Amino acid sequence: DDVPPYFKTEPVRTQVHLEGNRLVLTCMAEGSWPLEFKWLHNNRELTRFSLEYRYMITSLDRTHAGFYRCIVRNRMGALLQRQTEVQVAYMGSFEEGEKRQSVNHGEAAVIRAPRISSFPRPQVTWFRDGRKIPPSSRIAITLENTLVILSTVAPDAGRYYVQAVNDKNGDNKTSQPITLAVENIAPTIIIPPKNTSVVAGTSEVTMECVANARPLIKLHIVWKKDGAPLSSGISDYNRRLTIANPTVSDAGYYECEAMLRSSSVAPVTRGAYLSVLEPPQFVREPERHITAEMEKVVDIPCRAKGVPPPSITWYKDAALVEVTRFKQRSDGGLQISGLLPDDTGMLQCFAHNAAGEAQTSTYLAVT
Amino acid sequence: QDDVPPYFKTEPVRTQVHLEGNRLVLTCMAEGSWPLEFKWLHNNRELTRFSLEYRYMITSLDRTHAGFYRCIVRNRMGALLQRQTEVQVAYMGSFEEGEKRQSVNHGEAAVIRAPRISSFPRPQVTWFRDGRKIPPSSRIAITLENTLVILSTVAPDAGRYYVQAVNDKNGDNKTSQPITLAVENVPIAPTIIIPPKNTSVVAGTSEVTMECVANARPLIKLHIVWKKDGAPLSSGISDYNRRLTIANPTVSDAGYYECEAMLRSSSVAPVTRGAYLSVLEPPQFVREPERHITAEMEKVVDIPCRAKGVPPPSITWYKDAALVEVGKLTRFKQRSDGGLQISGLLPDDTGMLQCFAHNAAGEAQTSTYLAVTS
Ligand SMILES: *[C@@H]1O[C@H](CO[C@@H]2O[C@@H](C)[C@@H](O)[C@@H](O)[C@@H]2O)[C@@H](O[C@@H]2O[C@H](CO)[C@@H](O)[C@H](O)[C@H]2NC(C)=O)[C@H](O)[C@H]1NC(C)=O
Ligand SMILES: *[C@@H]1O[C@H](CO[C@@H]2O[C@@H](C)[C@@H](O)[C@@H](O)[C@@H]2O)[C@@H](O)[C@H](O)[C@H]1NC(C)=O
Ligand SMILES: *[C@@H]1O[C@H](CO)[C@@H](O)[C@H](O)[C@H]1NC(C)=O
Ligand SMILES: *[C@@H]1O[C@H](CO)[C@@H](O)[C@H](O)[C@H]1NC(C)=O
């Protein structure tokens, strides 16, 4: 008939799956006959148009990971689906071989964990000569799984290796030993806070600061958000700052201040920005159906807000609009001047972020 | 180091959706001294006995496997309760009901609820009249509950109505038995057929939708205005102004949302119906106990635990993965703030103490090892 395509629902932005498990992607669109469907992987065609609204993978492997989206069409026009990221849980082997490292006695030893390919990042247990190494006042283990001995002693010498476990599929692999040799002061920050981005509602995000001082027992780490002292979410010998349920208000400059108690010496601070992200949301949208006369000018509205502020891209029947008779306003609205009857079809406005994308559509009829 | 108390390196996701027939691997990512053993629970019922296996694996998921899973980790020092995960299984049953008959007066509203079908998640539903798709329109509304509402019936509305229901997670596609509608010949003020319902959502869900289906004669002059706490809204409104969708809901987005149905250019008074939007945030700890607590025998120790969230979180204490008796005539008392007070410390009070703050939006936990000296 004459019902333009439209989506009944949108897919989740991200989805994690096990290797060997089945994946079923759906294009939940409605519209007039014949409603046909085309699938894309990383914006590259997987299928040709058909009445099949599903894309099914019987047994997932790593090569299947990526962004999927469908294109729905009929006689009226075509729409680009909001894309979903399919992530496949896997774990490779430990690549590196045995290695050697040397540190001076009483100084900090920084031993980075051997690289292993894995999604998600694996949980890592450190071993010294077959014995587990839990965190302590002089032993720090970073979010990057880096081992940091704050003040080395002779019996620190030995063979260090990691056990890495993938929490999603339960894969468990052990690396080759790293031999540490121990060879015969104001507060310093060894592992500074890194810039961290997170989407609102992620439930947890952690900043980290590993500090060192002589004497070590007098070392005290103070956490601040935009200069304001923090007193919650702090753990792991004051090296981790964790924000539960982060919101855009939880964004800002988080600094780690390393100081010595009962000491005159000045503290040292290192800081990083926490970016809490909100996916795009439309403020103004075009009407479902727009009618306009030939050779005339039509203004099609599209405003969106998000954190960071969303960029706006227009599509005509699942294809990119070149902005010519087409102009895009600063607000993001589309202006089509000198309307031709062949400008008839589905126009789509995509508001995209680092946190995700949103879409709104309309059917333009040129009389 | 045979005396390192158990602790979790990470926690499982609060909710996870899986397909029938797919394999599930649950992990208890805990560290600690030997022997580190693991026990698994389904809806707080034991699945296994303690063992060195940190994984629980289901080869082929079905509907019965859905529910809450959590592990208990232990060693010589004590035991910790894992934060539990909800495993949800995507499925779809058959349409239970058979053919049915319905009657409406001409020019009046027809409300046809969709035939019940067992499915997770809720299926997307397309309505058909005599083999023809029924898209929403000025007189045709389709609710979030998949109910079909004809605002002003006419003679050719009579016929057989059925639904096509598709499960967007596994792509299952089933069709119901027809519902026969009869239109019987036997100026209507603006009324609200489907009023806004009380709706709850967790912050960061990215979308939550209120709905209001209104009816009036004439329908052409009918206009729906959406307001939050009395202030008219101009964004997130769609589906002929029947849907109000809030993207990226925050605690600030909570309040009283009312649907106002009015007739443009008309003497008649408008009608207003409203509901509450509850935006929820899972519990977050304000004050926590330290990693290790040492205390002298026969003395009193105060172990702190304060948490904030919406709704206000209730607080529950555990001693070695078992519920702590805070009831009267015990040595264990819970402060109003949520802190635990242990008076007359006995050497068997040594072990892992855990504080669980739980909401409707989820739970949070913090632990400590209590060592009682002398
Ligand atoms: C971390 O990133 C900042 C910039 O991040 C953005 O700007 C902030 C003001 C805040 O709005 C964040 O949420 C944004 O994501 C880096 O800041 C730069 O610093 C260099 C010198 O250090 C300066 O020349 C640049 O102008 C700054 N801005 C940019 C955009 O580069 C900062 O260096 C990063 N690293 C840290 C803090 O360790
Ligand atoms: C809906 O719920 C009402 C009470 O809801 C609670 O109180 C308000 C003030 C909000 O804070 C809300 O988040 C709470 O859950 C009931 O009074 C009412 O009967 C319920 N039903 C309807 C149809 O309104
Ligand atoms: C992981 O595998 C190693 C074998 O290399 C084994 O010693 C260790 O116990 C395993 N981890 C477990 C079972 O948690
Ligand atoms: C769903 O099943 C019905 C019933 O056979 C069929 O008519 C329809 O085409 C199916 N939908 C598809 C294949 O997308």
Author numbering:
A (entry chain B): 2 to 185, 193 to 331, 335 to 378
B (entry chain A): 1 to 186, 192 to 379
Article sentences:
Sdk1 and Sdk2 are single-pass transmembrane proteins, with extracellular regions composed of 6 N-terminal immunoglobulin (Ig) domains followed by 13 fibronectin type III (FNIII) domains, and a relatively short intracellular domain terminating in a Postsynaptic density/Discs Large/ZO-1 (PDZ) binding motif. Here, we report the crystal structures of cell-cell adhesive homophilic dimers of mouse Sdk1 and Sdk2, each mediated by the four N-terminal Ig domains. These four domains adopt a horseshoe conformation, like many other IgSF cell-cell recognition proteins, but they interact in a unique back-to-back anti-parallel manner not previously observed. Overall, our data suggest a model in which Sdks form cis dimers on isolated cell surfaces, which dissociate to form trans dimers through the same interface when contact is made to a cell surface expressing the cognate Sdk.
Although the Ig1–2:Ig1–2 interaction is present in all of the crystal forms of Sdk1 and Sdk2, there is a difference in rotational angle between the two horseshoes of the dimer among the crystal forms, with the Ig1–2:Ig1–2 interface acting as the hinge. Analysis of the Ig3–4:Ig3–4 interface regions in the Sdk1Ig1–4 crystal form 2 and Sdk2Ig1–4 crystal form 1 structures, which show the most extensive Ig3–4:Ig3–4 contacts, reveals predominantly hydrophilic surfaces with hydrogen bonds between N253Ig3 and P287Ig4 in both structures, S240 Ig3 and T291Ig4 in Sdk1, and T255Ig3 and E286Ig4 in Sdk2. However, there are three Ig3–4:Ig3–4 interfacial residues that show non-conservative differences between Sdk1 and Sdk2 that are mostly conserved amongst vertebrate orthologs (H/S243Ig3, Y/Q289Ig4 and S/R296Ig4). These differences result in the Sdk2 interface containing a π-stacking interaction between Y245Ig3 and R296Ig4, which is absent from Sdk1. Mutagenesis of a key Ig3–4:Ig3–4 interface residue (N253E) did not prevent Sdk dimerization, although it did reduce the dimer affinity, particularly for Sdk2, which went from 2.2 μM to 18.9 μM, implying a small Ig3–4 contribution to dimer strength of around 1.3 kcal/mol. This interaction is not seen in either of the Sdk2 structures, although the residues are conserved.
